[PDB]
């Protein structure tokens, strides 16, 4: 079963990249690109159609460690589009993906393209979490942002700033993802009075 997951994931990345690698009008660019993403989503749906509830999360930890083990950013973004359509179609509960994305210890700020694409995907899929999960995600995102130094390079700053849009989306009052009292409670638990 672990081997089965490995096989499906490896073949999907390699195949989609290589057929698209040669651009012989293989594709029509607008929503047929969305259809190739649908194609990865269907391969993921077949793989999921075979698993128990208690085993629902260790496979997801394997998926995210396999995505974060990659090196090509196009490969990473292709598997993140697969994970996005796997959440959007209703196959995956949209809390396990976000938690295993952020709590993955390969997600460090030095992996700046991985940082940017990860927090882009969490900005995409955070709108469906219940509010207690949004509170725990707020806590772990703040603790991830807290590891950045006072000074970083001038090129990596915009890709680092992708977590700030997730934070701005959670603490936005009109979106109402969670009661704002929970947000200020988590913040003031992390930045108590007198701390910048």
């Amino acid at each position: 079963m672990e081997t089965q997951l490995q096989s499906i994931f490896e073949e999907v990345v390699k195949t989609e990249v290589i057929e698209e690698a040669f651009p012989g009008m293989f594709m029509d660019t607008p929503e047929d690109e969305k259809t190739k993403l649908i194609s990865c989503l269907g391969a993921f749906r077949q793989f999921w159609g075979g698993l128990s509830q208690e085993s629902h999360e260790q496979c997801i930890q394997w998926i995210v460690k396999f995505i974060h083990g990659q090196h090509s950013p196009k490969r990473i973004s292709f598997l993140y589009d697969c994970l996005a359509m796997a959440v959007e179609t209703g196959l995956l509960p949209p809390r396990l993906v976000c938690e295993s994305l952020i709590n993955s210890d390969t997600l460090e700020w030095e992996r700046t393209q991985l940082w940017a694409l990860t927090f882009k995907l969490v900005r995409k899929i955070i709108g469906g979490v219940d509010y207690k999960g949004v509170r725990d995600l707020l806590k772990v995102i703040l603790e991830k942002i807290l590891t950045i130094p006072n000074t970083v390079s001038s090129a990596v700053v915009q890709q680092l700033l992708a977590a700030r849009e997730v934070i701005a989306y959670i603490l936005e009052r009109n979106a109402c993802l969670l009661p704002a009292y929970f947000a200020v409670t988590e913040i003031r638990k992390l930045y108590p009075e007198g701390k910048l």
């Binding site: 259809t35 649908i38 194609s39 989503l41 269907g42 391969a43 749906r45 077949q46 179609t89």
Partner: peptide, 8 residues
């Protein structure tokens, strides 16, 4: 083939 109801 399988899938056939999710794949385009």
């Amino acid at each position: 083939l399988s899938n056939y109801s999710t794949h385009p």
